[PDB]
Amino acid sequence: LDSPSFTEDITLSAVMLQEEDPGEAATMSMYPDFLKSFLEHPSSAVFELIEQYEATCNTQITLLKKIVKRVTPGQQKFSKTASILWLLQQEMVTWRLIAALYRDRIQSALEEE
């Protein structure tokens, strides 16, 4: 009983600030989460699975955005993390595109009768 939303996020952001590359570690942390999401969803629920991949990307993007905003412009370590942040944003929006287009394509193929 009662209330997670502000202290856990501060601890995780502070732990990743101790890693030599917080962008690579954010990417690595998502490998078990992607497999877990794949195993939890039956083959009939493929679009709920993509929505869960989008959500998993968005959680890490939000964490990395908080890290990048807290740092003074000009440290070479954070240019790599900013590049990985952009690549994870590109991954998230690519999953959203896949969900939109393949949902329409599959639904259309069922309605052509």
Binding site: P42, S43, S44, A109, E111, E113
Partner: protein, 798 residues
Amino acid sequence: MRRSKAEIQRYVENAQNSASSPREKSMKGFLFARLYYEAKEYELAKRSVSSYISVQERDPKAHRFLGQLFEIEGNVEKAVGCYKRSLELNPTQKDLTLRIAELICTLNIKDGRAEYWVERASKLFPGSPEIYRLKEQLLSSQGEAGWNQLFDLIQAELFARPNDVYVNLKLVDLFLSNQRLEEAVLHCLKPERRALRTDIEWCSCVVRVFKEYLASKQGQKNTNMRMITKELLLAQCDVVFLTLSKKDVQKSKEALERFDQALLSVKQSVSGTDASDLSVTFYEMRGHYYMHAGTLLLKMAQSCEVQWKALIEPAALCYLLAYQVPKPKSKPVKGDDNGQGFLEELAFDRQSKSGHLLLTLSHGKQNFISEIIETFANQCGQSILLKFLFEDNLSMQDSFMGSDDISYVENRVPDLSELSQHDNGSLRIHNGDLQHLTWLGLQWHFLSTLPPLRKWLKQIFPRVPQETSRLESNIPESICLLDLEVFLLAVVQTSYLQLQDNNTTADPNRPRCLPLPICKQLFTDRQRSWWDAVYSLITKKALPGTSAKLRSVIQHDLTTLRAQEKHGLQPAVLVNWARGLHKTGYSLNSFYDQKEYMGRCVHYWKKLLPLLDLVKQKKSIPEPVDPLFKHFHNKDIKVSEVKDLEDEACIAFATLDLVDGKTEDAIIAFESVKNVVAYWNLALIYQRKAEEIENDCLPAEEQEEFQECLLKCKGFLKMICDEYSAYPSIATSLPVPVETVFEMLDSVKQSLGEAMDDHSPAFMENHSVLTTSAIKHSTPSPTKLTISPSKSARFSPK
């Protein structure tokens, strides 16, 4: 109303007289052309559209419509010209590219334009069956160069569509045309071809190829010959089964005759001591032969060729002979499960079908199997069977049936526990076919026994949860086993009612349910479409791109199954679901399973109560125009039955509160109903309360509570005996035999001892205090987990 030529012409003349310019007259020409086409005046339609095209040359719809007019006249070259012009003006018309290719191939296959249009169509519709047919037609004209390209095309289409019967037949015919008989045989033997055994043309082609191969190799003792003879007997059995279902009686006789001769030819090669795979298959196929012979006799009675009475005993002997064939003894040879498990699945299917048909044909006569053995299990009975099946076409020596020994038949009635095991085996071959499931469910229903649907559904759908926490969801991914169980219970019930309404004029010797091959469709095409959509989605067998359409079919009819808003169900279906789930749930030893079944039973009772109020008010129940389950007015709930159903709903609510461990709320609820079933549940509660107190060293307070529980138990058991003594019809409403009530009453008297028989305190005078507060049977809305650890659940399932 079709407009007359004269009405159209008056309309055209008026519309032409009102037009200010020749251009304005021609602009109306497309509308006039459509009106003349609806009148079948194709010449006037052509003149009208040609006059429109001369003003609007860039309209694709006018050129398309002119092409359709030329096509109806058989002027294919002008039609193709008009369609090309329409396609040039609007390239989005993909359908027109296919139609141009079809028309060119129909006109002249040797036209070099045909290859261009077929290849252009192939890019627009990859893997279309019509494009495969057009490419086949083109390549078949090109000789040897066409042969290699046709082979490559067939391999590509079989890779895209392995289960296409037509493409598979064409590959076999292409091997036969090149004298490559060994490759035709190898292709027929492929394990992926088992899915094609439901098609009569495929099985007949396999039979043809294997007979031709065996004829070509006569004299060579090869291991391959025994394997091909094995698969030939299987393919002959499939041809008989499919001909029994899809063809007339005469074709079924000819199919069975060819199978009889095939068995006779193998009989000399099968010595009774050889545990060879061919010998095992031969005895299995002997059982199938008699099962199919019995089915053919019942088919002849159904076509009115012979009376039912004359063919029941001969057909029952054939099913007896089929039932008694021993199952193949599986040696689990570690390493190649695909071949021997299939004959065991066939044996389970034969034994299930033949055993249920023996019980159906006996009509409950105890000595029926004995009378049949004495009458027909002899050489005279064999000669009568041969005459019924083949007339004068086969002699006793030229027939497998005439040469077979049927004198060693056991007087064995099918056991229900063995049949339940055989039914679970038969489900593997039918892969969850709704006709098979409904047929088995009807057999059990005719025996007045609940079908073991839970076991069947766990075998077909091993990954589907038993229940869902989201009954208000209509999402296809939220389906549970209980949604499938109520679906099957309603299908079986609606099939049973449909068989009764059709049977009110039928011969008393007619079987209540016919064998599967000759049995009419037991369900509606909507029930089929829903079940096949569920099956295809859950098993991941759905065709690519169809999954959105399948989800929409499921989502619509899942609202009906869960009794959501405007479900349109007949009340009698909800009563049958609640009763079926109550009986199944009460028979389960698992607390969690009992709770799920009782929870779902109570859900349907809660949905039924407002409909019973409408029936009490003499209001009509809304019927859907196309219902998932047909309404049967012979089962409409009468106003007299409403009270007994309200009392049954209250019992089911009290049973759920008992299963939830709310024993006190359940006692109060049962005491309120004042029925034998409620008194029985009260007696069981007080007996269990006494057994929980029974520990070998009780304090005096616990000894008084123990005695009070036994006195309450004795009180309710006596009320059941007193009501049974007044009305012996109550034995049908009791959950247990009346003997079990007497045995429990006498055990409770022994535990109370003789010393208390004379002091009855007035068992009902002191609970006349607590007024009317509507007991809200609230299911918990989902409030977040707050763990308070201080009540260990007191209810262990002993």
